[PDB]
Symmetry: D2
Subunit: 116 residues, 4 copies
């Protein structure tokens, strides 16, 4: 995959399972267009969002639906979702892993960017 998402739960020390993820790409008129979506697996990973053909240069937004995740666990969290906004493939195709570490009042996000 050129774009992969990995989500961990810092309260349980486990992958964050069944987290909804929505990806958007900024259009020429400066609006967010839907690009791809999915849910994390039992390993907290989401693959197969896109192909290298479709994943062109652009500004992307990866929205990780954290409030929904915590609420299904009976926790009322602070954030609505985590939003990761970045320019992709500006110097040629790259492989991107977006990692997120979730707590109820806190999250972290890291990008690991590799040249295929």
């Amino acid at each position: 995959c050129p774009l992969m998402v990995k989500v961990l739960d810092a309260v349980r020390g486990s992958p964050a399972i069944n987290v909804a993820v929505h990806v958007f790409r900024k259009a020429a008129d400066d609006t967010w267009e839907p690009f791809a979506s999915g849910k994390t697996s039992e390993s907290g990973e989401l693959h197969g969002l896109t192909t290298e053909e479709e994943f062109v240069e652009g500004i992307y937004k990866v929205e990780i639906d954290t409030k929904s995740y915590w609420k299904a666990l009976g926790i009322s969290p602070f954030h609505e979702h985590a939003e990761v906004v970045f320019t992709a493939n500006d110097s040629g195709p790259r492989r991107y892993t977006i990692a997120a570490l979730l707590s109820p009042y806190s999250y972290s996000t890291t990008a690991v960017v590799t040249n295929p």
Copy 2:
């Protein structure tokens, strides 16, 4: 005083100084309306964004312009900006501090919510 922002720089171990911060409030047509903005002080803090009267329950977005901060330091970053989206809720008298810790390819954000 009901909403404060604090930004730290994980590379230099220092407050992140002169970072632009824009706050938005979600309108009833589900678009983001400008609400308040400022730049971080020498201590990495931004106070006086809003007042208790103006800061009603709703969904707010705090956007921290991290890319321009790193570009000014000669460092190539990943994110366009950091985005913290949350619901403000009345329960008792409460202060919101949004803290953000920045790295070029990573950031974390935490909400400290306390009483008067």
Copy 3:
């Protein structure tokens, strides 16, 4: 005032209150000697650990007793404690703030190093 500790609780979005903190200094036989200790205040802070006179260059260890904090909240944690080991260096007048953000299975720590 040359060394301060600040601890936040990522689960509740609050200062971590009444966390024991022990500071050690590495002796010439490479063992840890007790240096200072305290408990975090209502604001999650611990001041007055040392003085400028006493805080000479050397290797210091700050140990934050996180397990007992989580056990007191009924939450099962991973770490025995958080450990921050660093060298204090003279260059100009400098203040060290060790900040720590706690989750049951995760923590982060940052050093904010500033001038007078």
Copy 4:
């Protein structure tokens, strides 16, 4: 592996390669005994530290040599190393992944604990 270490570099957005890792186990006389050591691979991962037979109940310390890592990159960091101290296998054998995210003045650590 029952014990795995993964290290990421938050300045480069890449695995942290060639990071030395030393593992210790607390002995009955309350001293740290060497238990295993190794270096992260090109993927930032360290496997094969131990076997399920040798990885008994105990208090372990995983010391990640962060100062050495940054210095070889020409960066003078704050911390001497990251220290992760935890009780392992207290309720029966588990599989442990210790993840660390490194910046010069900051690091994060998370444990992912799975039941084989």
